[PDB]
Design an enzyme around this catalytic site. Structure first.
Site, PDB file in Angstrom:
ATOM      1  CD  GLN A   1      -1.318  -0.107   3.708  1.00 16.78           C
ATOM      2  OE1 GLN A   1      -1.971  -1.144   3.774  1.00 16.78           O
ATOM      3  NE2 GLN A   1      -1.448   0.855   4.588  1.00 16.78           N
TER       4      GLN A   1
ATOM      5  CB  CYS B   1      -5.056  -1.209   5.351  1.00 11.51           C
ATOM      6  SG  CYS B   1      -6.028  -0.157   6.479  1.00 11.51           S
TER       7      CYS B   1
ATOM      8  CG  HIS C   1      -3.583  -2.623   9.193  1.00 11.58           C
ATOM      9  ND1 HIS C   1      -3.479  -1.803   8.095  1.00 11.58           N
ATOM     10  CD2 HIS C   1      -2.816  -3.710   8.918  1.00 11.58           C
ATOM     11  CE1 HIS C   1      -2.714  -2.379   7.179  1.00 11.58           C
ATOM     12  NE2 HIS C   1      -2.296  -3.540   7.653  1.00 11.58           N
TER      13      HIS C   1
ATOM     14  CG  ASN D   1      -0.081  -6.442   6.496  1.00  9.59           C
ATOM     15  OD1 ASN D   1      -0.985  -5.657   6.313  1.00  9.59           O
ATOM     16  ND2 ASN D   1       1.004  -6.118   7.161  1.00  9.59           N
TER      17      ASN D   1
HETATM   18  C1  LIG Z   1      -5.047   1.319   6.672  1.00  7.62           C
HETATM   19  N1  LIG Z   1      -4.066   1.680   5.941  1.00  7.62           N
HETATM   20  C2  LIG Z   1      -5.537   2.237   7.818  1.00  7.62           C
HETATM   21  N2  LIG Z   1      -6.672   1.822   8.613  1.00  7.62           N
HETATM   22  C3  LIG Z   1      -7.960   1.943   8.324  1.00  7.62           C
HETATM   23  O1  LIG Z   1      -8.367   2.494   7.288  1.00  7.62           O
HETATM   24  C4  LIG Z   1      -8.868   1.394   9.414  1.00  7.62           C
HETATM   25  C5  LIG Z   1      -9.628   0.161   8.989  1.00  7.62           C
HETATM   26  C6  LIG Z   1     -10.981   0.205   9.709  1.00  7.62           C
HETATM   27  S1  LIG Z   1     -10.999  -0.484  11.253  1.00  7.62           S
HETATM   28  O2  LIG Z   1      -9.941   0.110  11.998  1.00  7.62           O
HETATM   29  O3  LIG Z   1     -10.832  -1.875  11.081  1.00  7.62           O
HETATM   30  C7  LIG Z   1     -12.406  -0.158  11.991  1.00  7.62           C
HETATM   31  C8  LIG Z   1     -12.511   0.724  13.045  1.00  7.62           C
HETATM   32  C9  LIG Z   1     -13.777   1.013  13.612  1.00  7.62           C
HETATM   33  C10 LIG Z   1     -14.962   0.446  13.168  1.00  7.62           C
HETATM   34  O4  LIG Z   1     -16.201   0.743  13.716  1.00  7.62           O
HETATM   35  C11 LIG Z   1     -17.436   0.575  12.985  1.00  7.62           C
HETATM   36  C12 LIG Z   1     -18.558   0.124  13.908  1.00  7.62           C
HETATM   37  C13 LIG Z   1     -17.846   1.848  12.230  1.00  7.62           C
HETATM   38  F1  LIG Z   1     -17.370   2.947  12.752  1.00  7.62           F
HETATM   39  F2  LIG Z   1     -17.452   1.691  10.983  1.00  7.62           F
HETATM   40  F3  LIG Z   1     -19.134   2.027  12.172  1.00  7.62           F
HETATM   41  C14 LIG Z   1     -14.847  -0.454  12.111  1.00  7.62           C
HETATM   42  C15 LIG Z   1     -13.599  -0.725  11.561  1.00  7.62           C
HETATM   43 CL1  LIG Z   1     -13.703  -1.850  10.213  1.00  7.62          CL
HETATM   44  C16 LIG Z   1     -11.264   1.695   9.838  1.00  7.62           C
HETATM   45  N3  LIG Z   1      -9.947   2.331   9.801  1.00  7.62           N
HETATM   46  C17 LIG Z   1      -9.634   3.598  10.061  1.00  7.62           C
HETATM   47  O5  LIG Z   1      -8.462   3.973   9.976  1.00  7.62           O
HETATM   48  C18 LIG Z   1     -10.688   4.631  10.442  1.00  7.62           C
HETATM   49  C19 LIG Z   1     -11.344   5.363   9.229  1.00  7.62           C
HETATM   50  F4  LIG Z   1     -10.386   5.947   8.500  1.00  7.62           F
HETATM   51  F5  LIG Z   1     -12.020   4.569   8.402  1.00  7.62           F
HETATM   52  F6  LIG Z   1     -12.205   6.240   9.677  1.00  7.62           F
HETATM   53  C20 LIG Z   1     -11.651   4.295  11.619  1.00  7.62           C
HETATM   54  C21 LIG Z   1     -10.509   5.280  11.827  1.00  7.62           C
HETATM   55  C22 LIG Z   1      -4.571   3.264   8.418  1.00  7.62           C
HETATM   56  C23 LIG Z   1      -5.613   3.708   7.384  1.00  7.62           C
END
Ligand SMILES: *C(=N)C1(NC(=O)[C@@H]2C[C@@H](S(=O)(=O)c3ccc(O[C@@H](C)C(F)(F)F)cc3Cl)CN2C(=O)C2(C(F)(F)F)CC2)CC1
Length: 219
Positions: free
Chosen positions: A20, A26, A166, A186
């Site tokens: 990535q 991710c 992640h 990954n």
């Molecule tokens: C990947 N390079 C990296 N991470 C992400 O984009 C991660 C992946 C998902 S998560 O962390 O798996 C996550 C976190 C919280 C939830 O809650 C549900 C109930 C909601 F809010 F969706 F309704 C689900 C999941 Cl799958 C999200 N994530 C993030 O970084 C966030 C966002 F960018 F998508 F907002 C949540 C912070 C570093 C970028």
């Protein structure tokens, strides 16, 4: 009864490991991963699907994905449902940057009709889905350098929490030298882990939140 060991790579359902880079994609790599699996199972073709198409085209209020700022596998699936398709990576290549949407239905390589969300924290349901459906998109806490440095055996770090950050892909499970593990693909490139894979503690109290937010698509 379920098998003791599953590895979807053995059935030709998993594409090569992706890198990535600088883009927080991710979530999009996890989502195309799971759809790649279903696509192989339903049509016999194994094709890398376009993570970039997800990064560029789902970055709006309706989904709450943020392109290279992060995103959700569930919303990726919903984009694909609404959009009526996704391109292959070959026609919509990965640029590790936010660009304007350039999806073209003439290059449609896969569709999605619905997705399934599995119960929070439920490692038994994850095992059932991984065994009977295919690879499953999941969130993990990959905030620790012990994750980063993994090379062999089974990752277990008592400083892991359920604070997932992640999106990765579970393509199997088993038991290695007495320790249950989830087999995770990954997107940090081939030099991460074991040729891009990590074995993570299974049946250890939802370790690193691996069964917290699990989903897979149906073609
Ligand atoms: C990947 N390079 C990296 N991470 C992400 O984009 C991660 C992946 C998902 S998560 O962390 O798996 C996550 C976190 C919280 C939830 O809650 C549900 C109930 C909601 F809010 F969706 F309704 C689900 C999941 Cl799958 C999200 N994530 C993030 O970084 C966030 C966002 F960018 F998508 F907002 C949540 C912070 C570093 C970028």
């Amino acid at each position: 009864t379920l098998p003791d060991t599953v590895d979807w790579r053995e059935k030709g359902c998993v594409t090569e490991v992706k890198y990535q880079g600088s883009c927080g994609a991710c979530w999009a790599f996890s989502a195309v991963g799971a759809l790649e699996g279903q696509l192989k199972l339903k049509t016999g073709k194994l094709i890398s699907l376009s993570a970039q198409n997800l990064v560029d085209c789902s970055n709006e209020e309706k989904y709450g994905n943020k392109g290279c700022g992060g995103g959700y596998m569930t919303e990726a699936f919903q984009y694909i449902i609404d959009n009526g398709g996704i391109e292959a990576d070959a026609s919509y290549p990965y640029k590790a940057m936010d660009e304007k949407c350039h999806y073209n239905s003439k290059n449609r390589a896969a569709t999605c009709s619905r997705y399934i969300q599995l119960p929070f924290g439920d490692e038994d349901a994850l095992k059932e889905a991984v065994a009977t459906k295919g690879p499953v998109s999941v969130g993990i806490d990959a905030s620790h350098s012990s994750f980063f440095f993994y090379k062999s055996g089974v990752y277990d770090d008592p400083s892991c929490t359920g604070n997932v950050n992640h999106g990765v892909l579970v393509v199997g499970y088993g038991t290695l030298d007495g320790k249950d593990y989830w087999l995770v693909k990954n997107s940090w490139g081939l030099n991460f882990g074991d040729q891009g894979y990590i074995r993570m503690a299974r049946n250890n109290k939802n370790h690193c939140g691996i069964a917290s937010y699990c989903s897979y698509p149906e073609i």
